[PDB]
Amino acid sequence: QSKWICLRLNDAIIKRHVLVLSEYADLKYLGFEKYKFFEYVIFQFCNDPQLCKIIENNYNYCMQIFKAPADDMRDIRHNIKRAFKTPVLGHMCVLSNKPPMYSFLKEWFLLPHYKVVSLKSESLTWGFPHVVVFDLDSTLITEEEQVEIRDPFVYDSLQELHEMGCVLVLWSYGSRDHVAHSMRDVDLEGYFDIIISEGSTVQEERSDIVDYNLKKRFIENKFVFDIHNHRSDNNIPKSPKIVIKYLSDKNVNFFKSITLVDDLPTNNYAYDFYVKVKRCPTPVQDWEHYHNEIIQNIMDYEQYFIK
Amino acid sequence: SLESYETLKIKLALSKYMAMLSTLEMTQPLLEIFRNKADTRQIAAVVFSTLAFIHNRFHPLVTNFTNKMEFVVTETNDTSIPGEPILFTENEGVLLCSVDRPSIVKMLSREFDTEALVNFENDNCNVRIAKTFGADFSITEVEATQYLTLLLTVEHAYLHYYIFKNYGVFEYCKSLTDHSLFTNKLRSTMSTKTSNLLLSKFKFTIEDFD
Amino acid sequence: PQQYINSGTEIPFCDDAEFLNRLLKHIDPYPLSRMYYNAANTMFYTTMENYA
């Protein structure tokens, strides 16, 4: 629960990317010119009013002041998109000069600043992309072990979504094996963008190849996850870390908004939108209302603010 | 670099030293004076001002200084000694320091190399072409080189002086015979500000070859 | 001695920090992180010469 402040760089020499500071003095860690890399930069509100006064006297950059008691990633994003009237925001830079312990945002991509040069743009969409992420084992499939397409209308809706550029990101928690069968069984991949498996579990991380099935080009479902929280509970959230990682692997570096669609609300750590799939032992053809919901969710920013 | 801003801090200390001598009674660029015998008193006074800045930054906790001391400069290799282009002396209470101009002048005649040698930020529109769109102060790297060179040379002398003052004549002789006390020693009382001292900044070795 | 800094009576100082900073700016790109070696080279050279 804190007041907050943000730089807005005057000359957007690099766009969209934003940073978070532990010190007003961190400018010294940044040195010359590199501030021109970061369109906006958030800092916790000054305790001493003289700091804010000197800031107010500085003309080198624009700035904003606000409250964000809501210590949440997506809520902060929403607030900032309001403040600067911008639908999209870049990645958050980090340094070995360790960030302020705003670790409530822990689960996120962190850019070690120098990768800024590594920031290629990408072809993959001519519009700014929306993204939707999915699961197999109990998400949208029929509950029969031989799953069925709930609706061929959905089957073609898959391709239709390309009209809007909605990117389609399956992460089955189930092993690669059932996906290996599913692929041959139904060319949803022929309608569908990105696939991942093995998400079921988290491993006790501590400091102490699949192509052969049919000559595929598919990912090593590597052990990229970590304990991350090391606490007495049993949650396997969908991971923006891995997700964005794969996105930048696809050179996907920006997005409008991302929705998770799954049967498990718990994994949603404040995703933009969550679609609790209605588990079904029949092809329900319920997709019509799911469509409508998602469309309205998209429209939310037609007003320039999600609400 | 995570040290890069500290290298900039070193640049800052350097410029702080430079501007004071560049403004206070700064008649001419160094070589114009040093090529001539004119106002050897001015030359020695500039040296003393350098020593003052050194006492300052090395031991800033107390700015007071025993400015009362004598000066000599020489033009005679029969007086000169290799390796110590400046030397302190005491004569029956007559504290004095002595120099040979020609040695240091001849020293400061080779700063003509160029850094066109090693890696830097990669050629890119970000590096340049980005600037191609949208958005007496006369100093050059060679002069800065020479000035830092002279500073570094005087550092040796100042450390020698400190030691001599604190330990008397015999230990001065001992150190001149053997500068090993210089050898790899940051360890100090905080008053020395030893990290301020540029020995911390650069390291070198010869290899005996063939 | 032809001179006597007993004539000296000062602790010379300057703090035109902003002027020094503007002057610093145009010297920022210089890679003394490379150049510095020149001084040591020439000093060692001269000392070698003097011993010879």
From Swiss-Prot, chain A:
Cellular location(s): Virion; Host nucleus; Host cytoplasm
Descriptive protein name: Uncharacterized 38.0 kDa protein in P143-LEF5 intergenic region
Function according to Swiss-Prot or TrEMBL: Plays a role in nucleocapsid assembly and is essential for viral replication. Distributed over the cylindrical capsid sheath of nucleocapsid.
Assigned keywords, A-Z: Host cytoplasm, Host nucleus, Virion
Keyword Metal-binding: no
Organism: Autographa californica nuclear polyhedrosis virus
Higher taxonomy: Viruses, Viruses incertae sedis, Naldaviricetes, Lefavirales, Baculoviridae
NCBIfam families membership: HAD-SF-IIIC, viral_ppase
Quaternary context: Interacts with VP1054, VP39 and VP80.
Cellular component terms (Gene Ontology): host cell cytoplasm; host cell nucleus; virion component
UniProtKB/Swiss-Prot annotation, chain B:
Cellular location(s): Virion membrane
Predominant location category: virion
GO biological process: symbiont-mediated perturbation of host cell cycle progression
GO cellular component, one term: viral envelope
Entry keywords, A to Z: Host-virus interaction, Membrane, Modulation of host cell cycle by viral cyclin-like protein, Modulation of host cell cycle by virus, Viral envelope protein, Virion
Functional description taken from the UniProt entry: Acts as a cyclin-like protein and plays a role in the modulation of host cell cycle. May promote G2/S arrest by interacting with host mus209/PCNA, cdc2 and cdk6. The cell cycle arrest is characterized by an intact nuclear envelope, concomitant with sustained activity of host cdc2. However, viral DNA replication still occurs in the arrested cells.
Complex formation: Interacts with host mus209/PCNA, cdc2 and cdk6. Forms a complex with proteins C42 and p78/83.
Family named by the database record: Belongs to the baculoviridae E27 family.
Protein name, entry field: Occlusion-derived virus envelope protein E27
Protein source organism: Autographa californica nuclear polyhedrosis virus
Part of the full-length chain shown: 38 to 272 of 290
From Swiss-Prot, chain C:
Highest taxon of source: Viruses
Disulfide bonds: none
Localization of this protein: Host nucleus; Virion
Protein family: Belongs to the baculoviridae C42 protein family.
Subunit structure: Forms a complex with proteins E27 and p78/83. The interaction with p78/83 mediates nuclear translocation of P78/83. Interacts with protein Ac102. Interacts with IE0.
Protein's job: Plays a role in host nuclear actin polymerization by recruiting p78/73 protein that is capable of activating an actin-related protein 2/3 complex to initiate nuclear actin polymerization.
Descriptive protein name: Protein C42
Native species: Autographa californica nuclear polyhedrosis virus (AcMNPV)
Section covered of the full-length record: 259 to 310 of 361
